[PDB]
Amino acid sequence: PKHGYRALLEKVDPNKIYTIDEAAHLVKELATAKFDETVEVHAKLGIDPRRSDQNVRGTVSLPHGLGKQVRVLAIAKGEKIKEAEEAGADYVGGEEIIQKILDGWMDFDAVVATPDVMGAVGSKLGRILGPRGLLPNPKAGTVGFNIGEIIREIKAGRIEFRNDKTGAIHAPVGKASFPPEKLADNIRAFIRALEAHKPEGAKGTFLRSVYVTTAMGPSVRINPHS
């Protein structure tokens, strides 16, 4: 999105490749104090993305911040509301829940949704969920009609990852509110999950470039082997 970020650019050296521990400490500085933000890791992979035998897809069981503890909100419609309840979502609502969130409620820690409510969710809650990194989307796997499976996967402590057509890949690894050592552990966990999924026959360096970022702030380049 358009960057106002500027008053935060001077804190990040764009030419430095930070260690994972330095980056975890930096991310904490920074982040706005006004709302929590999801921290993601983005990597460009040493794969030929036009080859179906070099796809990178799987899950990462983050050592911190997930499991039953995460309070998941599922927004759905009709039968899928029951499906979300039956899957154990902590909170469930139809489009009417949008009014509760607009009024100020955010007891939830994650948001998943069916595609049929996304027009309303984006329309009304885009500026609330977006900056917080809580806006569900199909590419991340947080929007789907298989709402029950999506909920059970998060509750089981797993985050999905899949490379895109450009050979890039990204996944959330925590929040800016996390203690830096926990954020570092989570960052390494995602890197290890990627490495474990390195396809047979991949050419050259696998993790070509890797960054830690948030939906609003600037990206921090990191050494994935640190």
Swiss-Prot record:
Superkingdom: Bacteria
InterPro entries xrefs: Ribosom_uL1_bac-type, Ribosomal_uL1, Ribosomal_uL1-like, Ribosomal_uL1/biogenesis, Ribosomal_uL1_3-a/b-sand, Ribosomal_uL1_CS
Molecular function per GO: rRNA binding; structural constituent of ribosome; tRNA binding
Pfam family membership, one: Ribosomal_L1
Gene3D superfamilies membership: 3.30.190.20, 3.40.50.790
GO cellular component: large ribosomal subunit
Annotated family: Belongs to the universal ribosomal protein uL1 family.
Name recorded for this polypeptide: Large ribosomal subunit protein uL1
Species of origin: Thermus thermophilus
Organism classification: Bacteria, Thermotogati, Deinococcota, Deinococci, Thermales
Underlying gene: rplA
